[PDB]
């Protein structure tokens with residue numbers, strides 16, 4: 001069921017933020033733990049930050065804020081090319097139950113298309129279940145996002161799910177869960193962009209997780 005997989009996801013979902021070691025943490029979005037001390041994180045969560053010298057990355061896992069210096073982080077790529085979502089290790093993080101196998105197999109991708117799906121996320125504290133779909137897919141495209149005073153955010157994302165939907169900023173980093181019960185309501189990828197009633201998630205497959213250990 002969708003709920004069952006939403007279940008697994010919620011337990012592994014954390015808030016991701018940036019801040020100085022002894023300063024205010026600025027929560028930017030979500031990150032999803034996948035096993036051990038490894039999480040999936042949209043590169044956009046820190047990629048436009050200015051100062052890496054004194055930037056710690058924060059993860060809120062059960063009301064406690066665990067952290068690691070950007071200078072000390074071990075970051076692993078999911079596949080070749082682009083890199084909009086990476087794998088990050090946070091050695092002091094309370095370990096996640098391995099949900100790697102709930103991730104869709106590359107050859108199963110066509111089974112998620114043209115079905116609805118559910119974006120399982122958080123908006124400051126509050127977890128939500130946002131309906132989307134039916135899902136489309138694009139090898140390459142440039143997508144609209146949120147920032148209203150100096151510069152908007154359009155993102156060229158490769159291998160991306162796109163689903164009609166209405167969301168809110170802060171949703172990025174949440175996981176997309178297929179309603180297709182024949183592929184076990186597989187996690188399809190990570191939400192990376194939301195604008196114009198379209199929701200975009202980078203595809204993340206079971207296979208990409210072979211490159212961590």
Ligand SMILES: *CC(=O)N[C@H](C(=O)N[C@@H](Cc1ccccc1)C(N)=O)C(C)C
Nearest residue numbers: 015027028029122123124169170171172
């Ligand atoms: C797509 C996305 O997540 N955008 C970010 C955003 O606007 N975040 C929220 C705050 C937040 C933090 C942690 C968990 C959920 C929500 C916000 N209204 O600033 C953006 C920072 C890229």
